[PDB]
Design a protein around this ligand. Structure first.
Ligand SMILES: Cc1ccccc1-c1cc(Nc2cc(O)cc(O)c2C(=O)N2Cc3ccccc3C2)n(C)n1
Ligand SMILES: [Cl-]
Length: 208
């Protein structure tokens, strides 16, 4: 497909035009919140939809040894067909919409309106590992790196999500401030006041 070129294009453009890198976390939390809204609504008519995971929440897990920041939610998750549609039709179409808004001088502050908000993670990450699990399907993993072509793979080696999506961001070397507890908490409190789901952070005792 065109993930190699799209990821390269959006990596370059997004890092060029969004100097406030901390909005990557706003986009992650907003997308998690939408996925959680989706399973919450589905559970109204089929309560058994929550059998996979009863709790609706967003959890942030930094790993300084690995250099990763993981945002996991217990939202509706993505089927393989959902993920394929994101990588194909949505990425191509939203890149066009984003680039035309960029070109026409239109306001592009809310990048998620173009359907490519996923790529705002390149503000701080050089690679994103997507794990996702929808009630109708198996757990899948897909990796995004600029210029890469990665096949969607059935994830049998990973920890079970139960249900939802986990975005694991491999943070660029100069930007490890985004793994720090106090920095994460300021950003969430600034950019996610109106989120109606618990936002959790794993804090680890430090040596020393
Ligand atoms: C990965 C990718 C590559 C290329 C283009 C786009 C994407 C791509 C993938 C996603 N999905 C998620 C991103 C997240 O940060 C967190 C999530 O929980 C999800 C998710 O599972 N849903 C399911 C669903 C159901 C209803 C409404 C909203 C959502 C979001 N979004 C928005 N965008
Ligand atoms: Cl966890």
């Amino acid at each position: 497909g065109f993930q190699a070129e799209i990821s390269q294009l959006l990596d370059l453009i997004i890092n060029t035009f969004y100097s406030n890198k901390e909005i990557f976390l706003r986009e992650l939390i907003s997308n998690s919140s939408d996925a959680l809204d989706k399973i919450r609504y589905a559970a109204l008519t089929d309560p058994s939809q929550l059998d996979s995971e009863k709790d609706l929440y967003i959890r942030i897990i930094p790993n300084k040894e690995e250099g990763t920041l993981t945002i996991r939610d217990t939202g509706i998750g993505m089927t393989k067909a959902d993920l394929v549609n994101n990588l194909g039709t949505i990425a191509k179409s939203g890149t066009k919409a984003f680039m035309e808004a960029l070109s026409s001088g239109a306001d592009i502050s809310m990048i998620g309106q173009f359907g490519v908000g996923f790529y705002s993670s390149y503000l701080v990450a050089e690679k994103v590992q997507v794990t996702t699990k929808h009630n109708d399907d198996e757990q899948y993993i897909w990796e995004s790196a600029a210029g890469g072509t990665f096949t969607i793979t059935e994830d049998t080696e990973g920890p079970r999500l139960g249900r939802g999506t986990s975005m694991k961001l491999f943070i660029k070397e100069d930007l490890k401030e985004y793994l720090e507890e106090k920095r994460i908490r300021e950003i969430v409190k600034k950019h996610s006041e109106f989120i109606s789901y618990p936002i959790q952070l794993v804090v680890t005792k430090e040596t020393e």
